[PDB]
Amino acid sequence: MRLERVLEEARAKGYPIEDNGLGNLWVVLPRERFKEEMAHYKAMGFNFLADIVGLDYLTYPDPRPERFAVVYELVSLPGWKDGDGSRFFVRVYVPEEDPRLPTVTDLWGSANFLEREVYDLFGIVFEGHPDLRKILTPEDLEGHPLRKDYPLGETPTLFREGRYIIPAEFRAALTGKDPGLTFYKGGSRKGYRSLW
Amino acid sequence: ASSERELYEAWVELLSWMREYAQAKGVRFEKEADFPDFIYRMERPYDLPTTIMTASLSDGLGEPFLLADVSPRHAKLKRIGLRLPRAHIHLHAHYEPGKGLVTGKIPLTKERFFALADRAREALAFA
Amino acid sequence: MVRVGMRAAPRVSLEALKAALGGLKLSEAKVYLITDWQDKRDQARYALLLHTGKKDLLVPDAFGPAFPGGEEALSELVGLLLAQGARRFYEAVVSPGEMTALLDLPPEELLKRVMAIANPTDPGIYL
Amino acid sequence: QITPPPRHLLETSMEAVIYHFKHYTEGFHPPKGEVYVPTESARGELGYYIVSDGGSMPYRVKVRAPSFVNLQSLPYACKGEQVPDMVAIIASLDPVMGDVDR
Amino acid sequence: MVRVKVNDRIVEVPPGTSVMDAVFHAGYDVPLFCSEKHLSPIGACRMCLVRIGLPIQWQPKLAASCVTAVADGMVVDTLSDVVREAQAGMVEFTLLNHPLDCPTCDKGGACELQDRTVEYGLYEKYPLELPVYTRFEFTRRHVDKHHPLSPFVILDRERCIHCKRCVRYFEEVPGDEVLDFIERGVHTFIGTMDFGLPSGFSGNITDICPVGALLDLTARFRARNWEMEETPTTCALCPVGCGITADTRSGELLRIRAREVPEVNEIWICDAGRFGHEWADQNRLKTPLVRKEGRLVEATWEEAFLALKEGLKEARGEEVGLYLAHDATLEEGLLASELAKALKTPHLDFQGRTAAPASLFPPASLEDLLQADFALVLGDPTEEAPILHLRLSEFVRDLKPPHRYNHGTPFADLQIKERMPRRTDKMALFAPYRAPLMKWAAIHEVHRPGEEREILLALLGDKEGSEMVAKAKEAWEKAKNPVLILGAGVLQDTVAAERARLLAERKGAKVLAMTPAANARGLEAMGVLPGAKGASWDEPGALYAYYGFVPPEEALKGKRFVVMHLSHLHPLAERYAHVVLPAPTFYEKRGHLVNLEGRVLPLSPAPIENGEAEGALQVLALLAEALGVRPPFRLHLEAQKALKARKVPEAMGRLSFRLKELRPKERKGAFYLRPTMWKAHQAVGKAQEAARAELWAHPETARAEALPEGAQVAVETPFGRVEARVVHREDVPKGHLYLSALGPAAGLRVEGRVLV
Amino acid sequence: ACPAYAIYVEPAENDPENPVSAGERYAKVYEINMLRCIFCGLCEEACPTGAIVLGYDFEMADYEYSDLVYGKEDMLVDVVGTKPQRREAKRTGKPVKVGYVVPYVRPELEGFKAPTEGGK
Amino acid sequence: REGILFTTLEKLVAWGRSNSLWPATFGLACCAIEMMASTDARNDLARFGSEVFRASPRQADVMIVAGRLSKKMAPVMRRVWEQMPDPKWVISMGACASSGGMFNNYAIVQNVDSVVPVDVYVPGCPPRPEALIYAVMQLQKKVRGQAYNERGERLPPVAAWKRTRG
């Protein structure tokens, strides 16, 4: 029930409402309204903060507003005091040159680790955090691994007499921007979805 | 029916003749292609006698003048076929029981095939 | 980032590195001995990339037993780096073609790639 | 587009050979979009936030690691408890560090 | 411009646009077999079908978007169920009789049929019903298989889907009809009565065939399409520098293919560049050698450098030779120049230095060549600058550069109709022999060597030429935008190039100079030319010399110190050279060249087995160390900085450089060094007999001189001793013997003899 | 179909007189890096001629990296044992004893000889 | 004195060390679970001499690298090797440890032999418990001087005996 009220509260102020026909909902809040709105979101009854998922869209085929985008996942547990079960995502775009975003540690302690992880994997600093300390990558590692401008750093596979493989030039798989080995891709290899 | 079996057997027999001619006139013979249902059969069991489906007699320039083919194992309207390239000439043989290998109603014996291949050699072969 | 030494001249590369290293303290430096083919060290060749954080140093492929006087030169080199107080030694395995071009990429990409692919190594394998 | 052709008609049909080859080399290309599904594993809510770009390989796969958010409650759980019990309180939390570090 | 609507999108598009280009420019997609870039669209595969409305006025039958013109305000529907079902049906018809060879097919993953099948086939029929792929449960079409049409090309007549691409190309692009169908119905098949596949541009069909019918024998059964490691680079066999792809896997050379760059070569490569790669990965030098017991020994770089120090200890700086190859980069030339400036030596050169520089003349771009009014050509494009021929074939047919859409070059240019006529009034060609292009040039005269200068003089009007030269002069005087095109024969004879300069300045006209050397104009731009003394690449004037190429046998003889910087091992080095060193080919180098039109081009390095080879930058730097002089270049980045200081534009940028100086030398005329497409160092493997040496003789004078029509005659030239098949030609003048100059020493008139 | 790209397949052209495969192509060099191999079963799944099929031997522990690249003649069904096993059988003189028994071999393993449930 | 310097004594002590292999696991990933399963009541490495399990490294001779070796752990595990008594052996268990495996990336050591001297490699994913027993028997015959490579060479009893630690 509270999700419908979220949608009605957001639509009045001009917030885009994203929806796929699969049962997943997005409400994109600007960064100004982000903090206060999500504070209100906790006040609206969001006990549980599932995820903080950061996204780097450098190599995405279509352009996006900003390079980085951080998505928080808000839920209300059905089995607690008054449990509805309404779960949804909030996306907030973060510039390449402005990896700033207020923490919800004060709101949810759940983001204590989660936000740290995104500072490790992305260059995104979450302002007001108790400790933004590199979690996963070694202390002497330079950079942020999950952003697309950071190499995966593969090593060649080894064989008997000088026969070696460099997997990046061995992949028959394509990416979204990879043109393929023929003049073009259309049809199924431009995006494919069955009509149930 | 079961005539199919002997047909493939007869088909194998046909190949022999071809090879013999290669030694006779000193002309190049080549195995063109083998059965797909024998390459790509992975575990599936295979009872057919030979593995070769298409072969040809090529001249000194390598360009074929005589082609012979047999129908695959699971296809409809099975036959054995002969073709003279560039000459718009097609022959379609069956195997009739008691008679033998016949082109339609007319028997296809060794002598007939030898004459046909010799005519192709004298006429069509460039070098 | 500076480049000293010359390819396939182990003693020249080693003496030039002796001169250029000087009194630089390597307590926080990163030593990248770049090679190919993880297993076979008896014929191995090595480049070197030393990242102090303040400035970097590049030695081309002139070290390893693959060259005359190369094994003793790599032993002297790793002993020198350990003497100057380094603890962090790294080995990157690149394709043969990468060894050549990687020293000709711009400094930022070469350094980022080496740092991303480097494996912690025991200097005992080079001593 | 999602299933390679059955193995028996690989020697009969051309489209089978092309589709078997393509499916096992290139794969299929799902549409551009994001998706996520919840499940209950022995350590909690589990799901993959998959961003696909229309290519053979996913643009990004983010994992909600239930063992990652389950671990923020250790200093609280083992707060004030005994020293030997710190091992039991950790084994009792059931962490699989393949899930946390990831 | 005309407004079109594709299914949700509205696009401005110029009027002559094909519906297919409007779909793709609009961002949609449609199957494509029959049509190809630069080929006349004809509705054959019937794959390009769309829905068209022109008022909602839907057409009765599906429209062929490959041969449809577009009208203002047209609705194009590629997503309707009818279109998708029809496209899947046509795929079914096309794959109906296909040989089931995908896993063992050399085409593998880069097969258009595979991709369009998995794209559009098997429409969504409406359950989770058990689906059937093919309805064809009958006997398939079987024809001749794995037939080598030529030492480079293999033919599988079963894989052909009966498009028109190879025959369309064969009539259109080279103008050499050596392929067409034989029969009709479903029995149709490809064949030829011209067996040698004579055209010098046959290889491109290898790339065009949307199936694996025609495959590259020199790259058959090496690796799979995705497996090959691709190195995009530029070919330095001849100065046109076509964009190529060097596919290598496991340190060796697998295959050469076309890289599209419409500025210089469109999508086309010549057979020499594409199939003539066997020599690179086969047999080449990996260890520096040193002379110890009056013989050659494997050595370290250290010991060679020591011998170098000692040999050049007593060498004065003005007697040293600095001689590079014809394919030397801007980096290397600029460093040799600067190093002979510091170490003051007047004579440095490169292998293909012409007496008259190519920089004299203003370069022209090829698209200008398409828009010119006339082309006065002296020399053989087929042999001196091969892909020029192809561009002349757009030039002679009134074709012009198409528009550049959102999917790149247009898929269906309505500007190219099929079976186009070729004009005999658009160009005038003068060669010492009857070239294939003479067929499309009415104004044509077969002359003898040393006679160009007179044709050019007559075109100026200072004397009176033949009927053909008078027509050429008249059309040149009348033409508003003519092109002058000079081969090597003109560029190597100073007075002829001088009269060309005069003729091309007086009428405002730019020049296409088909140099024997690829980076000749760039090395001139970087300053690789001798000084006053003048020991050039062929002269024995210097006393100490460094060589980056193969000099004439007499140039090594006499010197005190000679060092060659080679890739393969040459007997001239193991008998006259003191220190030999390994170099990577242009295939695996990294640097920049300058096109015969003045455009700079990139060299990326190939994962080929170089050994311990090093670029000549490092060698010249190391060689000046023995001389005291310090080098200004060590790497490619500092070299690029110093280049940008030398005012050389960015890659693909054209460099402006003129030069007013000539260095003439006599030519002792008994034999001719015919310019050859095939290069000597390519005679390995499958080009061994293709890149063979020939001796062209007039039947009368051949008969008088006892040269049989098939004989392997041994010939000794200053440029080496080679055996050569004798060819009787009734267009070769009497008294001369045209020896196939398989190097970048073409266009020279040299002494010599036929040995017995 | 290898997620590690651990299989190297150099192809070559059959000799019609004494061929190796049924078609016009064969595998001149067929290697597997057991230290790269993760034992999926995707390679058996993608083989269209049924050539590559996972077996049953697990006793392939060896001492050297360069000794853990299994070759063609180290994996043909005609071979009996793993590399260290065969090498020990040669330097020992005692035939190979496999450390496993199976109820049967699958049809996909036609030819593979194995101990079957107690039939022997 | 290193188990050497007498024809009978060195064979005796090789016997003793071989059947006295004290495995010290360094459990890293899903390889480690298949090693722990090699202790249950179907297949126990508790017979050959490997019953006791001293977590301390000062007390065990066999070090079994069972799992992917991430770089952040590389020195720590390393020091456990330096802090071991000298007659010590190192086994590399699984694909991620032996080679880079399928995780051919920035994070994982592409051969644990980089930081520690590996005795035996045991492919598999995970290597079957019986395969891990095979590798410990392999190491048993290796320290007996009973192990040869494909090239004909005999392998020395102890790897980590030939290295200049630093």
Ligand code: SF4
């Ligand atoms: S031409 Fe294409 S579809 Fe036909 S066998 Fe070759 S790869 Fe398969």
Ligand code: SF4
């Ligand atoms: S051989 Fe290839 S390019 Fe030529 S018509 Fe057939 S499919 Fe087209």
Ligand code: SF4
């Ligand atoms: S035309 Fe010249 S540059 Fe182009 S591919 Fe041929 S040899 Fe190379």
Ligand code: SF4
């Ligand atoms: S089982 Fe081994 S070789 Fe086969 S696909 Fe998997 S990891 Fe690769």
Ligand code: SF4
């Ligand atoms: S080799 Fe396999 S079982 Fe062992 S740690 Fe790696 S993924 Fe896990």
Ligand code: FES
């Ligand atoms: S019919 Fe071939 S695409 Fe138009």
